[PDB]
C-alpha cells in the first residue's frame, strides 16, 4: 500500500449527467482496483497552454489515494479506456520541498 | 477578388531565397511572392534586396485585394528576413505585430551531413 | 522490495541471542533473502546485466561468510545451511 495522486483531465463540454457518469465510472474503477480515496480536489474547467483533443480547455480532477503498487499501472490503463477522458497522470506522492521558507 | 482588408503575412526566409505569403486571418493564402517571382534566378534570390522586392510585390498584390493591416509571422534565419520586415513596414500596409514562429525540433530528426555536428 | 517487517522477521529468526544484528548467521540469512529476491527478478528481465553483477557480488559475499563459518564452527555451519537450504 503506497500513496499516489491521480490527475484526470476531462472533456469541458460535458453536462451534469455525462460528467456525473464519468465520475461514477472513475470511482468504480478506483474501487475495483482496491484504491482507497483519502482526499479529493475537483478543480474543474481551466485554460490549457495548448489544445488537448482540439479543445482549448479541460476539466481537472485530483485524487489522493492509497493503493497496492502492483495494480497501479493497470488502474491507469483502465482510466484511459474511457472516450471522454483526456489525460490520466498517476504520480507517486511526495513531501513538499520549500524554497524561501 | 475578396475584399479582406486585414490579414496575415508570412515571411519564410532561408539562405537561398525569401518567399512571402499574404493570407486572410483564417490562414488561407491570397497572394505570394519570392526572389524568383521577380527577375532574380540564381543565388541572387537570397539577397536582402530580393527580399525587399518580394515583400513589396506581395504587399502590392495584396492591396489589390483591398488589404489594409497585416500581422507578420517570420520563419527561418537568413538574410533579407529583417529586410522583408522593413519593406513590409514601408509597404503601405499597417503592420500590427511581428512574431517569430521559426520551427525547431526537440532533438527530432537526423540532419544532412552539411547540418551535422548537431541533431 | 524488502520492507521493514520482512527484514526484522528474518533477523529475529536467525539471531543467536536477542539483540543480535550482525552475526554471521544473520548476515547469511539476509544475503540469502536479497539473493532469492534478485534471482527471481532476473528470471524475468534477463537483459538486466547491471543487477546481475549485484547478484554475483552478493553470492560471493555469502560464500565467503559461509567459508568463515565452516572454518570456525562446522556444526553452526551445518545448522545454518540445513536451515536456509543453501549449496547443493
Amino acid at each position: 500500500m503506497r500513496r499516489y495522486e491521480v490527475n484526470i483531465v476531462l472533456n469541458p463540454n460535458l453536462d451534469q449527467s455525462q460528467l456525473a457518469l464519468e465520475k461514477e465510472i472513475i470511482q468504480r474503477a478506483l474501487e475495483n482496483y482496491g484504491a482507497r480515496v483519502e482526499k479529493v480536489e475537483e478543480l474543474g474547467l481551466r485554460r490549457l497552454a495548448y489544445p488537448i483533443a482540439k479543445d482549448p480547455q479541460g476539466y481537472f480532477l485530483w485524487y489522493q489515494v492509497e493503493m497496492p503498487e502492483d495494480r497501479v499501472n493497470d488502474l491507469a490503463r483502465e482510466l484511459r479506456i474511457r472516450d471522454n477522458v483526456r489525460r490520466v497522470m498517476v504520480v507517486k506522492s511526495q513531501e513538499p520541498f520549500l524554497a524561501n521558507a | 477578388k475578396r475584399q479582406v482588408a486585414s490579414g496575415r503575412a508570412y515571411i519564410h526566409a532561408s539562405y537561398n531565397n525569401t518567399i512571402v505569403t499574404i493570407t486572410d486571418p483564417d490562414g488561407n493564402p491570397i497572394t505570394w511572392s519570392s526572389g524568383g517571382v521577380i527577375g532574380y534566378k540564381g543565388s541572387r534570390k537570397g539577397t536582402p534586396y530580393a527580399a525587399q522586392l518580394a515583400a513589396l510585390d506581395a504587399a502590392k498584390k495584396a492591396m489589390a485585394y483591398g488589404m489594409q493591416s497585416v500581422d507578420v509571422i517570420v520563419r527561418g534565419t537568413g538574410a533579407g528576413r529583417e529586410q522583408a520586415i522593413r519593406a513590409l513596414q514601408a509597404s503601405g500596409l499597417q503592420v500590427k505585430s511581428i512574431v517569430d514562429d521559426t520551427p525547431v525540433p526537440h532533438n527530432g530528426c537526423r540532419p544532412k551531413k552539411k547540418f551535422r555536428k548537431a541533431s | 522490495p524488502i520492507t521493514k517487517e520482512e527484514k526484522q522477521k528474518v533477523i529475529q529468526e536467525f539471531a543467536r541471542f536477542p539483540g543480535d544484528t550482525g552475526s554471521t548467521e544473520v548476515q547469511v540469512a539476509l544475503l540469502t533473502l536479497r539473493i532469492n529476491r534478485l534471482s527471481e527478478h532476473l528470471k524475468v528481465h534477463k537483459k538486466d546485466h547491471h543487477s546481475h553483477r549485484g547478484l554475483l557480488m552478493m553470492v560471493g559475499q555469502r560464500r565467503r561468510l559461509l567459508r568463515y563459518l565452516q572454518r570456525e564452527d562446522p556444526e553452526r555451519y551445518r545448522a545454518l545451511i540445513e536451515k536456509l537450504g543453501i549449496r547443493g
Binding site: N7, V9, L43, R46, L48, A49, Y50, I52, G58, W62, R87, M89, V91, Q94, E95, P96, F97, L98, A99, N100, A101 | V74, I85, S97, I98, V99, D100, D101, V104, H106 | -
Partner: protein
C-alpha cells in the same frame, strides 16, 4: 546574460514540487516556453533539478506550454 531581476529573489514561499500550481511556475519560463537557466531563476542545483521535473509534469498535464511564439521582433 540574465541582466534584469532575480526570479527567486522576488517571490514568496512555495512548494517546488507542486506541478499543479501554474501562477508560480509561469514565472520560471521565458517569453518562449523555455525553462529559464539557473542564472535567471536564481535557484540552486537541487532546486533547479526539482523545478525542471515539476515544470515538465505540468506541461504534460497541459498546464504549462512547451514552446511559444516570440513577439515584437
Amino acid at each position: 546574460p540574465s541582466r534584469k531581476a532575480k526570479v527567486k529573489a522576488t517571490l514568496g514561499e512555495f512548494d517546488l514540487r507542486d506541478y499543479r500550481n501554474v501562477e508560480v511556475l509561469k514565472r520560471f519560463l521565458s517569453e518562449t516556453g523555455k525553462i529559464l537557466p539557473r542564472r535567471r531563476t536564481g535557484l540552486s542545483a537541487k532546486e533547479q533539478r526539482i523545478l525542471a521535473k515539476t515544470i515538465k509534469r505540468a506541461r504534460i498535464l497541459g498546464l504549462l506550454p512547451f514552446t511559444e511564439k516570440l513577439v515584437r521582433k
